[PDB]
Amino acid sequence: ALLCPFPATTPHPQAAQLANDCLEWTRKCGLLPDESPRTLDKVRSYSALAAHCYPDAHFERLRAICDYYSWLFFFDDVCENTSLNGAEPKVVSSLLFDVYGVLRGHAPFAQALADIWRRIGDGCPGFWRRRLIRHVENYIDGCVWEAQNRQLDRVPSRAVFEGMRMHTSTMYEFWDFIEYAGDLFLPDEVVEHPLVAEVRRAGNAIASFANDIYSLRKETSNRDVHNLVVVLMHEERIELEAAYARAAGIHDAQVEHFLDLVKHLPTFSATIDRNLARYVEGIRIWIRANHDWSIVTPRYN
Amino acid sequence: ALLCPFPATTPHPQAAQLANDCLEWTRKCGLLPDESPRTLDKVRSYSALAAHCYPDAHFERLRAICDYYSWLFFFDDVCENTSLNGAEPKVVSSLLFDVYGVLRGPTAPFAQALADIWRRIGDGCPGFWRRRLIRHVENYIDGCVWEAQNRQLDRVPSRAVFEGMRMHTSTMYEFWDFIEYAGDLFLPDEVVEHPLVAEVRRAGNAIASFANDIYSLRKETSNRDVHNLVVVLMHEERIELEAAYARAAGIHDAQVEHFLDLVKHLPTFSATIDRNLARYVEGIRIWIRANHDWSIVTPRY
Ligand SMILES: [Mg+2]
Ligand SMILES: [Mg+2]
Ligand SMILES: [Mg+2]
Ligand SMILES: [Mg+2]
Ligand SMILES: [Mg+2]
Ligand SMILES: [Mg+2]
């Protein structure tokens, strides 16, 4: 039902082993809420997503990303539930900063994140580490804002939600990981160039709004409001199906916008231009992978 | 210092009478905190800004816009002081929604004065434009409640989150809306929401807002406020003030160059719409230069 003009890509050749190793790591780190087939299948699903998003990565880099996918799904759920079940924003803030603090210098999640970070950190330069950390700090701010909305029993206005969703989605982190997974790093002058930044935002919006459309049933069952469809219903005073259609239109316009923008990328140098082209291709791969996965993942379905 | 590539324009020829009339309206409505000459000169200065920002508007439209400039300065200051002096976000939210609720109809000096402005503006605009303005007001309210959140939590927001929220707290999207009202030429939703046009609107918002942060830093820090690009840079990048001014100027200048490029590739819609879009973009240019010339000399900063 959504515009997805990007072709599918063969997943990483070691996808099966990746899922097995990742599941064992999540268990050993104590991150599984239970050992039901539903829970284990979800972890296997996240690992399938990772293997389709970064199909050309060296195995051990993909393994670290894969661990982060599962770690983040679980910890974001913990932080969401903390807020949904009535915690003050200060408590949500303390939880996030306490766990993510290991990126600069605590229950199951701090130690497990430190383990991921030790492996990723060894394969990346400082300027990229600061870039990822900033995107994490952006996400934390976005999550504390969500917690404030819940404390105030508020549905955010659409323009503000769409902006903040770019942070809560963590997709900027997963663009960062395109560089890590390919071992091809872009200088700040490139990713911060306003045209490239708008490409990154558009791809974020495509993936995040697709997630919203497909994750709507789960989030509404959870009494959560941070979903483009719910936000559209409240702002425009429309019913669910009409809001789905508006959300799809917004998604599709971002797709068209992305495709236009990437035809007019700024130029820097033969080497940087080639790395930027691989980075943008990585975003295209991620978008299609996310699209196909969202339709079938048991997390939403 | 800051890049301003947009030539200046003569102000509205009735600028002097406009300032006199606006001051008398501001006094009659009871919005003046006191009758000192520096308070009165602030109103005169904001009316001078209005007369430079919409120099071709019919006088009665410019007059309503002018009353809103001064109304907004005073009321935004009341909301800032409410939060700076310890109010919980819910109190800030209630103050804002109670006063701005009159944009939807009759429901305090500020609410009555806003209703008077809105009665006049509404008589000269279609419904879709009124909803657009009201939505941008609601975005700004969300932005202000978020600032109150940060102050309650003693948080300096990370830069990317601040820059996105600053687009709403600046109210510049409302003043782009007023370009349509001032010229009595209204763009359909499909045009202003087109992602390329939206990015033009955002870039212009950033140019004006980040210039305002740079020039309005000395007074915002004497107010114990952190919602300023320069301060946000110091905390995020761990740099000293002059370095942060330099970074902020570079970010401003990159948005300017981005804007200059984007407006050469506007989408086409129809004969009349394209003509009106060209006037709208030119209005943003006029506004940006008018704001630049005024910010350097205004008593407010
Ligand atoms: Mg979430
Ligand atoms: Mg979630
Ligand atoms: Mg979701
Ligand atoms: Mg303000
Ligand atoms: Mg202010
Ligand atoms: Mg300011």
Coordinates of C-alpha atoms in Angstrom, one line a residue, chain A residues 56-289:
Chain A
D56 CA 27.6 -6.3 2.8
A57 CA 29.2 -6.0 6.2
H58 CA 32.1 -7.9 7.7
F59 CA 30.5 -10.5 10.0
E60 CA 31.9 -9.2 13.3
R61 CA 30.7 -5.7 12.6
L62 CA 27.2 -6.9 11.7
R63 CA 27.3 -9.1 14.8
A64 CA 27.8 -6.0 17.0
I65 CA 25.1 -4.0 15.1
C66 CA 22.8 -7.1 15.5
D67 CA 23.3 -7.1 19.3
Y68 CA 22.5 -3.4 19.3
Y69 CA 19.2 -4.0 17.4
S70 CA 18.0 -6.4 20.0
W71 CA 19.4 -4.5 23.0
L72 CA 17.7 -1.4 21.7
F73 CA 14.3 -3.0 21.0
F74 CA 14.3 -4.4 24.6
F75 CA 15.6 -1.2 26.3
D76 CA 13.3 1.1 24.4
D77 CA 10.4 -1.0 25.4
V78 CA 11.5 -0.9 29.1
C79 CA 11.8 2.9 28.8
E80 CA 8.4 3.2 27.1
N81 CA 6.7 1.0 29.7
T82 CA 8.3 3.0 32.5
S83 CA 6.6 6.1 31.2
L84 CA 3.3 4.5 30.1
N85 CA 2.8 3.0 33.5
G86 CA 3.2 6.4 35.2
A87 CA 6.8 7.4 35.8
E88 CA 7.7 11.0 35.9
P89 CA 9.9 12.3 33.0
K90 CA 12.8 12.8 35.4
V91 CA 12.8 9.0 36.1
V92 CA 12.8 8.2 32.4
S93 CA 15.6 10.7 31.9
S94 CA 17.7 9.2 34.8
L95 CA 17.1 5.6 33.4
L96 CA 18.3 6.6 29.9
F97 CA 21.3 8.7 31.0
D98 CA 22.4 6.1 33.5
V99 CA 22.4 3.3 30.9
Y100 CA 23.7 5.2 27.9
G101 CA 26.4 6.8 30.1
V102 CA 28.7 3.8 29.3
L103 CA 29.2 5.4 25.8
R104 CA 31.3 8.1 27.5
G105 CA 32.9 6.3 30.5
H106 CA 23.0 0.1 35.1
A107 CA 21.1 -3.1 35.6
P108 CA 21.3 -5.7 32.7
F109 CA 21.4 -3.0 30.0
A110 CA 24.4 -0.9 31.0
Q111 CA 26.8 -3.9 31.0
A112 CA 25.4 -5.3 27.7
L113 CA 25.7 -1.9 26.0
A114 CA 29.3 -1.6 27.3
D115 CA 30.0 -4.9 25.6
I116 CA 28.6 -3.8 22.3
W117 CA 30.4 -0.5 22.5
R118 CA 33.8 -2.1 23.2
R119 CA 33.5 -4.0 19.9
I120 CA 32.1 -1.1 17.8
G121 CA 34.4 1.4 19.4
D122 CA 37.5 -0.4 18.2
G123 CA 36.5 -0.2 14.5
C124 CA 35.7 3.5 14.1
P125 CA 37.4 6.9 14.4
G126 CA 36.7 9.4 17.2
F127 CA 34.6 11.8 15.1
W128 CA 32.2 9.0 14.2
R129 CA 31.9 7.9 17.8
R130 CA 31.0 11.5 18.8
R131 CA 28.5 11.5 15.9
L132 CA 26.8 8.3 17.2
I133 CA 26.8 9.6 20.8
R134 CA 25.1 12.8 19.7
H135 CA 22.4 10.9 17.9
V136 CA 21.9 8.8 21.1
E137 CA 21.7 12.1 23.1
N138 CA 19.1 13.3 20.5
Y139 CA 17.1 10.1 21.1
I140 CA 17.2 10.5 24.8
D141 CA 15.9 14.0 24.5
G142 CA 13.2 12.7 22.3
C143 CA 12.3 9.9 24.8
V144 CA 12.1 12.4 27.7
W145 CA 9.8 14.5 25.6
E146 CA 7.5 11.5 24.9
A147 CA 7.5 10.9 28.7
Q148 CA 6.4 14.6 29.2
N149 CA 3.6 14.2 26.7
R150 CA 2.4 11.1 28.7
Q151 CA 2.7 13.0 32.0
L152 CA 0.6 15.8 30.5
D153 CA -1.9 13.3 28.8
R154 CA -1.1 15.1 25.6
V155 CA -1.1 14.1 21.9
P156 CA 1.6 16.2 20.3
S157 CA 0.9 18.4 17.3
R158 CA 1.9 16.9 14.0
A159 CA 4.8 19.1 12.9
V160 CA 6.4 18.8 16.3
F161 CA 5.9 15.0 16.4
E162 CA 7.4 14.6 12.9
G163 CA 10.5 16.5 14.0
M164 CA 10.9 14.7 17.3
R165 CA 10.1 11.3 15.7
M166 CA 13.4 11.7 13.7
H167 CA 15.1 11.4 17.1
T168 CA 13.0 8.8 18.8
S169 CA 13.1 6.5 15.8
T170 CA 17.0 6.1 16.2
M171 CA 17.3 5.9 12.4
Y172 CA 20.0 8.5 12.5
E173 CA 22.0 6.0 14.5
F174 CA 21.4 3.3 11.9
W175 CA 22.6 5.6 9.2
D176 CA 25.7 6.1 11.3
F177 CA 26.1 2.3 11.4
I178 CA 26.1 2.2 7.5
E179 CA 29.6 3.8 7.9
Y180 CA 30.7 1.4 10.6
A181 CA 29.4 -1.7 8.8
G182 CA 31.2 -0.7 5.6
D183 CA 34.3 0.6 7.3
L184 CA 33.9 3.8 5.2
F185 CA 33.5 6.9 7.3
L186 CA 32.2 10.3 6.1
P187 CA 33.6 13.5 7.5
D188 CA 31.3 15.9 9.4
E189 CA 31.3 18.4 6.4
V190 CA 29.5 15.7 4.4
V191 CA 26.8 14.3 6.7
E192 CA 26.2 17.8 8.1
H193 CA 25.9 19.5 4.7
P194 CA 22.3 20.7 4.6
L195 CA 21.5 18.8 1.4
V196 CA 22.8 15.5 2.8
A197 CA 21.2 16.2 6.1
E198 CA 17.9 16.5 4.3
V199 CA 18.5 13.2 2.5
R200 CA 19.2 11.6 5.9
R201 CA 16.0 13.2 7.4
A202 CA 13.9 12.1 4.4
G203 CA 15.1 8.5 4.7
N204 CA 14.5 8.6 8.4
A205 CA 10.9 9.9 7.8
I206 CA 10.3 7.2 5.2
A207 CA 11.4 4.4 7.6
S208 CA 9.8 5.9 10.7
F209 CA 6.5 6.8 9.2
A210 CA 6.3 3.3 7.6
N211 CA 7.0 1.9 11.1
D212 CA 4.2 4.1 12.5
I213 CA 1.7 2.8 9.9
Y214 CA 2.6 -0.8 10.6
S215 CA 3.2 -0.5 14.4
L216 CA -0.1 1.4 14.9
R217 CA -2.1 -1.6 16.3
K218 CA 0.5 -2.4 18.9
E219 CA 1.0 1.1 20.1
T220 CA -2.7 1.9 20.4
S221 CA -3.2 -1.4 22.3
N222 CA -0.4 0.0 24.5
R223 CA -2.3 3.3 24.9
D224 CA 0.6 5.2 23.3
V225 CA 0.1 8.3 21.2
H226 CA 3.5 8.7 19.5
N227 CA 2.4 7.5 16.0
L228 CA 1.8 9.6 12.9
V229 CA -1.6 8.1 12.4
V230 CA -2.8 8.9 16.0
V231 CA -1.3 12.3 15.7
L232 CA -3.1 12.9 12.4
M233 CA -6.5 11.8 13.9
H234 CA -6.1 14.3 16.8
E235 CA -4.8 17.2 14.8
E236 CA -7.1 16.9 11.7
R237 CA -10.1 15.6 13.6
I238 CA -10.4 12.6 11.2
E239 CA -11.1 8.9 11.7
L240 CA -8.6 6.0 11.6
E241 CA -8.8 4.9 8.0
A242 CA -8.7 8.5 6.7
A243 CA -5.7 9.0 8.9
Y244 CA -4.0 5.9 7.6
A245 CA -4.4 7.4 4.1
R246 CA -3.0 10.8 5.1
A247 CA 0.0 9.0 6.8
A248 CA 0.6 7.0 3.6
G249 CA 0.5 10.2 1.5
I250 CA 3.0 11.8 3.8
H251 CA 5.2 8.7 3.6
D252 CA 5.0 8.6 -0.2
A253 CA 5.8 12.3 -0.5
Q254 CA 9.0 11.7 1.5
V255 CA 9.9 8.8 -0.8
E256 CA 9.5 11.0 -3.9
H257 CA 11.4 13.8 -2.1
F258 CA 14.3 11.4 -1.2
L259 CA 14.6 10.2 -4.8
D260 CA 14.7 13.7 -6.2
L261 CA 17.3 14.9 -3.7
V262 CA 19.8 12.1 -4.3
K263 CA 20.1 13.1 -7.9
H264 CA 21.6 16.5 -6.8
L265 CA 24.1 15.5 -4.1
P266 CA 26.9 18.0 -3.4
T267 CA 30.4 17.1 -4.5
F268 CA 33.5 17.0 -2.3
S269 CA 36.2 14.8 -3.8
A270 CA 36.5 11.6 -5.9
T271 CA 36.9 9.5 -2.8
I272 CA 34.3 11.2 -0.6
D273 CA 31.8 11.3 -3.4
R274 CA 32.1 7.5 -3.8
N275 CA 31.8 6.9 -0.1
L276 CA 28.7 9.1 0.0
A277 CA 27.2 7.2 -2.9
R278 CA 27.6 4.0 -0.9
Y279 CA 26.2 5.6 2.2
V280 CA 23.1 6.7 0.3
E281 CA 22.8 3.2 -1.3
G282 CA 22.9 1.9 2.3
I283 CA 20.0 4.1 3.2
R284 CA 18.1 2.7 0.2
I285 CA 18.8 -0.9 1.2
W286 CA 17.7 -0.1 4.8
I287 CA 14.5 1.4 3.7
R288 CA 13.5 -1.6 1.6
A289 CA 14.6 -4.0 4.2

